[PDB]
Ligand binder design. Structure first.
Ligand code: MG
Ligand code: MG
Ligand code: MG
Ligand code: MG
Ligand code: MG
Ligand code: MG
Ligand code: MG
Ligand code: MG
Ligand code: MG
Ligand code: MG
Ligand code: MG
Ligand code: MG
Ligand code: MG
Ligand code: MG
Ligand code: MG
Ligand code: MG
Ligand code: MG
Ligand code: MG
Ligand code: MG
Ligand code: MG
Ligand code: MG
Ligand code: MG
Ligand code: MG
Ligand code: MG
Ligand code: MG
Ligand code: MG
Ligand code: MG
Ligand code: MG
Ligand code: MG
Ligand code: MG
Ligand code: MG
Ligand code: MG
Ligand code: MG
Ligand code: MG
Ligand code: MG
Ligand code: MG
Ligand code: MG
Ligand code: MG
Ligand code: MG
Ligand code: MG
Ligand code: MG
Ligand code: MG
Ligand code: MG
Ligand code: MG
Ligand code: MG
Ligand code: MG
Ligand code: MG
Ligand code: MG
Ligand code: MG
Ligand code: MG
Ligand code: MG
Lengths: 172, 170, 203, 116, 48, 119
RNA sequence: CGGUAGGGGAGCGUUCCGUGUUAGGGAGAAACGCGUGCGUGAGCCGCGUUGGACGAAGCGGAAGCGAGAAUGUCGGCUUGAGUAACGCAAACAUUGGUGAGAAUCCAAUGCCCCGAAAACCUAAGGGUUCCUCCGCAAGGUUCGUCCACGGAGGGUGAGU
RNA sequence: AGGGUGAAAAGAACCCCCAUCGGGGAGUGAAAAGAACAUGAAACCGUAAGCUCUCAAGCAGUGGGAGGGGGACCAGACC
C-alpha cells in the first residue's frame, strides 16, 4: 500500500498550554533532525515550550520502540506540526470602564517519527542499478513483484514517480 | 501470488528483505543481449518515422478569413450552412499555392485550383462570456455566447499545375 | 561538496533518462534561415500556421545575435540614435516581437566626435536631480562631452528604447566607447546600415 | 556613554549594590562556595580579594577595616586565622568562577563562585 | 498612531518567520553546548 | 412556512470562487472581494477580446513592414500594400505576416511579381 | 436590438402542501465535494476510496422565498504583535529542606521597610474567605510543590 | 448562554511513555463513533508535493505565452 504504513509512528499531544507561535519556534528547529540530536537540543534550549515538546518526543520514541519495534538510533523526526487548540477567553478591567479580552491559547502537537533503515534492502539495491538496468530487471517480474519492489520510498526520493507511469511500468 | 506472498511477508514480518521479493534466480538479461533490447525497446520506444504528406500548401478563403492549409490536417472554421458530417466539399477560392519547388500566385485567385476537404464535424465553440458592465449605474449583464463551428479535414490540393508558376532562380 | 553516493548518482542518471525521452518525442527546432513552410514532423504538431508566430527559446538565444558598429564621427546625434534604437529593439527583423528580445548588439565608437546642429553644443542641457531640495544639477552638452562623453549617447539612446523590464535589459546591449577602438573584435562586428539621408553632416 | 567607567552596577542603586556585595562576601567566606548570577559573581571578585588581602597583613587596623565590611564578626576572626596558612604563597587570585546551566524561571545565566 | 490598514497575510508570515529564526541560532548554541558537556573535559562548566 | 436560506447562497458563492482560483492574495479568499474581482476579470476579458483584433493587425503590419524593408532601398509597407491592390491580390495581413516569417522566399517572389508587373 | 430613474414581457431557484403511505433509497437518501457535460442567465444534468436515512421528476398550490452594503445584528476568527504593558523608586541575599520540576513553597542566618502604622482590637459590612488533609484543569497579570482557588472533613460554648 | 458517542456503556482489562493530564498498542463495537465523541461549510492557523520571485513601481487582473511540471484518450487537446 503506502510508506506511511511502514515507517511511521504518529503521536499527538493534546492541549498543551504553549501558545501556538511559541511552540512553533521550537518545532521548526527539530524538523528533519535525528532523534539523538533533537534530544540533546531540547534538553538545553532556553525556551519553555521545549520541555513539553521534549516529553512528547521521548514518548513517541518509546512507541516506535515498544509497539512497532524500531531501533532508536534510526529515528528521525519526519513531519512535525502545531495546530491551534481550544482558546479560553477571560475578560479583564481596564482604565475608564473599558474592558479587554485575554486569550489563553492551547495547541495540539503532532510529531511523526520515521525510521530510515526500513526499506533499505530495496533502497540500496535499487540505487545499485543504472536507469536502463533497472527497467530491464523489471521486464521479468509480474505486476505483483513490480509493485512489491518499487513500493519503497524509492520513487519519491529520486523523483521518478510520474516517469514510471509513463513507461507503462505500472497500473493505477 | 507473488503479490499476495510478498505482501503477507511484508505484513507478518516487519522490515522486509530483498531476497524474498526478488529471488536470486534472476540475474537480469545482459546489456548487449537481444532479450535486453526487446524489453528496452518495449518500455523506451524510439520515436517513429513521420507519416508521408505531399509537400504543398494553399491559402484558401473560408467565411472570409484566409487559412493556410496543408493536407492531412484539420482546421476550424465558420459553420458551413447545410453541411453534414462526412461530406466532400471543394473550397474554390484559392489565393496561393506553394510547393518547395515552385509557387503559384493568383490574380486574385489561382484559376482552376480546388481544395478537396471533408467535413468531419459540427461543433459549438468554448463558451465565451460576454459581460456588460457599468460602474455605479448598477447594471450588469451576464451573457454567454457559444459560436457554431465547423471542423473540416483537408485531403488534397489540386488543379494548379497549368497556371503559370514563378520561382526564385539565382 | 558534490556527493558521489549511489543516491545522487542514481538521481542524475534518471534525470538524463527523462531528458532523453522528452528530447526524442518532442518536435525538432528548425531555425529561421531559408526555412520552408513545414517539416514532415511539425505537420503532426500544433497549429502554427493559422495562429500568429511567436518565438521560442531556441531563437533569441543571446549567443547568436548580430553585432554592429557605428562610427559616430560626423554623425548627427538624434538621427543616429533612432537607427540604433531600431536595431537594438529588433524592429528590422521579420521575426520581431514586442515581448521578446530579437534585437542586435550595437557598438558605438568615437563618441566624442558625434555632431550636433545649431547652437546646441552650448545650449542643450543635461540635468539630473539629487532627490534633496535644491538638488538640481545642470551641464551644458559640452562640459559633458569634455568630462565623460559616452554618457551623451547612452542617454540619447536610452530615451528611445522602451521603458520597463525589457527596456532596461535591452539597454545593456548598447556598448559605447570614446576611442576609435573597441575590444570586441572577437564578436566580428558588421557595420550598421543607415538609410537616412540627413544623418551625415558635412562642413 | 561610559568610556572607562569600570564598576559593576548589578542593576541596583548605590546603597543596595554596596549592601548586596557585602552580603555576598560574608556568604562566600561562611560557606566557601556559592551559586549566583554571572554578573553578581564577576562583580564580587574584587571585594572577596579585598578581604583576603586585608587578612594577609593582620594588623589591628586592617581587622577593623574588614570588620566594617563583612557583617558577621565570627567569619572575620576565622578569616584572619585561616588565611595566612591557606593563602600565604598565593599572590592574588583567590577566586574561581565556574558557570552552569541558566536558571529556569527567568533564564538568567548562573555561576558558581568558589573560594580557591 | 494606528494601523490605517490590516497587514496582508504574506507579509505577516515573513515577519513572524524572522522572529522564528532566532530559535535557530539558539538551537546552534544549545547543540554546541551539549557537545561540550558530553566530553566531560570542561573545568569552566559544571552540571549536577 | 419559515424558510432558512440554506445552501442557495453557499452554492452561488462557491461557483464564484471556482472562477477566481489563482488570484494572488485576498482576491482568492474572501467572498466579498472575490465577487468584485470576478466581475472585473469578466470585464477585461470582454474588453480585450476586442483589443485582440486590433493588436494582431498591429503586429502583423509591423512584421510585414520589417520583412519588406529589406529588399528595395526605397520600399515600405505603404508602397507594398498599394502595389498589392493595384495588382489585384487578395492576401490579407495575417497571411503575409505568417508567410513573411515561415516562408521568406515566398515573400521575395511575391515582391518580384509586383515589381515585374509595375515594370 | 447603449442605457439611469422608471414601465412592460418571459423565466429560474428555495421551503412547504396536493397527486403520495409516489418513483427511487444501508446494492448508500438528504447533504458535502467534484466536472474537457447542457443552458442567454438565474441554474440544470451527470459523478463520487466523503456521508449515514430519507425522498425526486412531472402537472399544480402557498409563502417567515433569493443579501455585499443598513456607523445593520449575533456568533466565530484575524490585524495591530509575540509589540505595549505586568499596578510605586521598602531590597533583597545565600545555605539547606520538600519535590518529576523552585528567582517565587518551608526553615535558618544575615540585610532592608513601617512603627499616631504597613501594629493590636472592636462597629458596620462580607458570608465560611477561618482550621486540617488532599489537588494543581480554570482563577493568580510570570512561576507555583503554594493560595483568600478547587475537593473532602471539622470549627463559633456566656445569669455578668 | 450551554441540545444530538453508540442499538447497547459494551465508557477501553493488560503492556509501554508515565508525578497527573495526555498518548501509542491491545481489547469492545457495523464503524474509534473514544467521551472537548454524530453531518462538519467559510473565515482563520498550518504541513507536504509541483512551478516560480531578491534591478523592482503594482486595484494585482486580462489578451498574447517563453521556459518547466502534471493526469490523458480523440494524444494538434485538457490542467
Ligand atoms: Mg472602576
Ligand atoms: Mg482596552
Ligand atoms: Mg444607481
Ligand atoms: Mg541612603
Ligand atoms: Mg534605599
Ligand atoms: Mg584595586
Ligand atoms: Mg422547516
Ligand atoms: Mg431570510
Ligand atoms: Mg492563470
Ligand atoms: Mg444600436
Ligand atoms: Mg436595451
Ligand atoms: Mg431599470
Ligand atoms: Mg428542484
Ligand atoms: Mg425541498
Ligand atoms: Mg416505498
Ligand atoms: Mg447521490
Ligand atoms: Mg429536505
Ligand atoms: Mg442539481
Ligand atoms: Mg427541475
Ligand atoms: Mg440507520
Ligand atoms: Mg413533487
Ligand atoms: Mg432540491
Ligand atoms: Mg420575514
Ligand atoms: Mg455579513
Ligand atoms: Mg468599526
Ligand atoms: Mg462582531
Ligand atoms: Mg494574533
Ligand atoms: Mg510596533
Ligand atoms: Mg520597542
Ligand atoms: Mg517593554
Ligand atoms: Mg496600563
Ligand atoms: Mg506588582
Ligand atoms: Mg525606619
Ligand atoms: Mg494588615
Ligand atoms: Mg488580626
Ligand atoms: Mg461585627
Ligand atoms: Mg468557597
Ligand atoms: Mg488558610
Ligand atoms: Mg494552575
Ligand atoms: Mg499561572
Ligand atoms: Mg508533589
Ligand atoms: Mg479551600
Ligand atoms: Mg488507552
Ligand atoms: Mg509529584
Ligand atoms: Mg490516560
Ligand atoms: Mg485496537
Ligand atoms: Mg472487532
Ligand atoms: Mg463532528
Ligand atoms: Mg538599473
Ligand atoms: Mg531578476
Ligand atoms: Mg514588481
Amino acid at each position: 500500500p503506502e510508506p506511511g504504513k511502514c515507517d511511521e509512528i504518529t503521536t499527538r499531544g493534546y492541549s498543551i498550554s504553549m501558545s501556538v507561535d511559541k511552540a512553533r519556534r521550537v518545532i521548526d528547529q527539530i524538523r528533519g533532525r535525528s532523534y539523538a540530536e533533537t534530544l540533546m537540543i531540547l534538553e538545553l534550549m532556553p525556551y519553555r515550550a521545549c520541555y513539553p515538546i521534549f516529553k512528547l518526543i521521548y514518548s513517541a520514541a518509546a512507541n516506535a520502540s515498544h509497539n512497532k519495534q524500531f531501533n532508536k538510533a534510526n529515528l528521525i523526526i519526519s513531519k512535525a506540526e502545531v495546530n491551534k487548540g481550544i482558546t479560553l477567553k477571560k475578560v479583564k478591567p481596564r482604565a475608564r470602564g473599558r474592558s479587554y479580552m485575554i486569550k489563553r491559547p492551547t495547541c495540539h502537537i503532532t510529531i511523526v517519527l520515521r525510521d530510515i533503515t526500513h526499506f533499505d534492502s530495496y533502497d540500496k539495491f535499487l540505487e545499485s542499478l543504472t536507469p536502463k538496468k533497472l527497467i530491464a530487471l523489471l521486464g521479468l517480474m509480474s505486476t505483483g513483484r513490480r509493485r512489491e519492489l518499487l513500493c519503497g520510498r524509492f520513487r519519491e526520493n529520486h523523483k521518478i514517480k510520474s516517469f514510471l507511469y509513463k513507461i507503462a511500468l505500472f497500473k493505477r | 501470488l507473488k503479490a499476495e506472498f510478498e505482501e503477507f511477508q511484508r505484513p507478518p514480518n516487519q522490515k522486509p528483505q530483498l531476497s524474498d521479493v526478488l529471488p536470486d534466480d534472476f540475474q537480469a538479461p545482459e546489456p548487449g543481449t537481444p532479450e535486453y533490447n526487446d524489453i528496452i525497446n518495449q518500455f523506451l520506444p524510439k520515436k517513429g518515422p513521420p507519416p508521408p504528406r505531399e509537400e504543398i500548401f494553399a491559402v484558401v478563403v473560408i467565411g472570409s478569413r484566409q487559412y493556410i492549409v496543408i493536407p492531412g490536417r484539420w482546421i476550424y472554421t465558420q459553420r458551413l450552412k447545410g453541411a453534414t458530417v462526412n461530406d466532400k466539399i471543394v473550397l474554390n477560392k484559392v489565393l496561393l499555392v506553394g510547393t518547395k519547388a515552385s509557387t503559384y500566385i493568383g490574380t486574385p485567385i489561382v484559376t482552376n485550383a480546388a481544395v478537396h476537404a471533408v467535413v468531419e464535424e459540427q461543433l459549438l465553440d468554448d463558451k465565451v462570456i460576454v459581460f456588460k458592465y457599468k460602474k455605479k449605474k448598477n447594471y450588469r449583464r451576464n451573457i454567454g455566447h457559444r459560436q457554431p463551428i465547423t471542423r473540416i479535414k483537408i485531403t488534397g490540393i489540386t488543379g494548379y499545375e497549368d497556371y503559370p508558376a514563378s520561382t526564385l532562380e539565382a | 561538496r558534490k556527493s558521489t553516493s549511489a543516491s545522487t548518482k542514481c538521481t542524475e542518471e534518471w534525470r538524463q533518462l527523462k531528458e532523453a525521452v522528452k528530447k526524442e518525442f518532442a518536435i525538432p527546432h528548425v531555425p529561421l534561415d531559408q526555412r520552408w513552410m513545414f517539416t514532415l514532423e511539425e505537420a503532426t504538431g500544433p497549429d502554427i500556421w493559422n495562429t500568429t508566430w511567436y518565438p521560442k527559446s531556441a531563437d533569441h538565444v543571446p549567443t547568436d545575435k548580430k553585432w554592429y558598429v557605428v562610427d559616430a564621427t560626423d554623425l548627427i546625434l538624434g538621427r543616429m540614435a533612432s537607427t540604433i534604437a531600431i536595431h537594438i529593439r529588433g524592429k528590422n527583423l521579420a521575426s520581431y516581437t514586442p515581448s521578446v528580445d530579437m534585437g542586435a548588439f550595437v557598438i558605438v565608437v568615437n563618441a566624442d566626435k558625434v555632431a550636433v546642429s545649431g547652437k546646441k553644443r552650448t545650449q542643450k542641457l543635461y540635468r539630473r536631480h539629487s532627490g534633496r531640495p535644491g538638488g538640481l544639477k545642470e551641464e551644458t552638452f559640452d562640459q559633458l562631452q569634455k568630462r565623460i562623453p559616452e554618457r551623451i549617447i547612452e542617454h540619447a539612446v536610452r530615451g528611445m528604447l522602451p521603458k520597463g523590464r525589457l527596456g532596461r535589459y535591452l539597454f545593456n546591449h548598447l556598448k559605447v566607447y570614446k576611442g576609435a577602438e573597441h575590444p570586441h573584435q572577437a564578436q566580428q562586428p558588421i557595420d550598421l546600415p543607415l538609410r537616412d539621408k540627413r544623418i551625415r553632416v558635412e562642413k | 556613554m561610559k568610556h572607562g567607567r569600570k564598576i559593576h552596577r548589578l542593576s541596583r542603586p548605590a546603597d543596595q549594590r554596596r549592601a548586596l556585595l557585602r552580603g555576598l562576601t560574608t556568604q562566600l567566606l561562611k560557606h566557601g562556595r556559592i551559586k549566583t548570577t554571572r554578573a553578581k559573581a564577576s562583580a564580587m571578585r574584587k571585594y572577596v580579594d579585598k578581604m583576603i588581602t586585608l587578612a594577609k597583613e593582620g594588623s589591628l587596623h586592617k581587622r577593623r577595616q574588614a570588620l566594617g565590611f563583612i557583617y558577621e564578626k565570627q567569619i572575620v576572626h576565622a578569616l584572619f586565622a585561616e588565611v595566612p596558612e591557606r593563602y600565604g604563597d598565593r599572590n592574588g587570585g583567590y577566586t574561581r568562577i565556574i558557570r552552569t546551566l541558566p536558571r529556569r524561571g527567568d533564564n538568567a545565566p548562573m555561576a558558581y563562585i568558589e573560594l580557591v | 498612531a494606528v494601523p490605517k490598514k490590516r497587514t496582508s497575510i504574506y507579509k505577516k508570515r515573513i515577519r513572524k518567520n524572522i522572529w522564528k529564526k532566532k530559535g535557530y541560532w539558539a538551537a546552534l548554541k544549545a547543540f554546541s553546548l551539549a557537545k561540550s558537556l558530553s566530553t566531560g573535559n570542561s573545568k569552566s562548566f559544571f552540571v549536577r | 412556512t419559515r424558510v432558512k436560506r440554506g445552501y442557495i447562497a453557499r452554492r452561488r458563492r462557491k461557483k464564484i470562487r471556482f472562477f477566481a482560483s489563482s488570484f494572488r492574495g485576498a482576491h482568492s479568499r474572501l467572498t466579498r472581494t472575490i465577487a468584485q474581482q470576478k466581475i472585473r476579470a469578466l470585464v477585461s476579458a470582454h474588453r480585450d477580446r476586442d483589443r485582440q483584433k486590433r493588436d494582431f493587425r498591429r503586429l502583423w503590419i509591423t512584421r510585414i513592414n520589417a520583412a519588406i524593408r529589406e529588399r528595395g532601398v526605397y520600399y515600405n509597407y505603404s508602397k507594398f500594400i498599394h502595389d498589392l491592390y493595384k495588382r489585384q491580390l487578395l492576401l490579407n495581413r495575417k497571411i503575409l505576416a505568417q508567410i513573411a516569417i515561415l516562408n521568406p522566399n515566398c515573400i521575395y517572389m511575391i515582391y518580384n511579381e509586383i515589381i515585374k508587373k509595375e515594370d
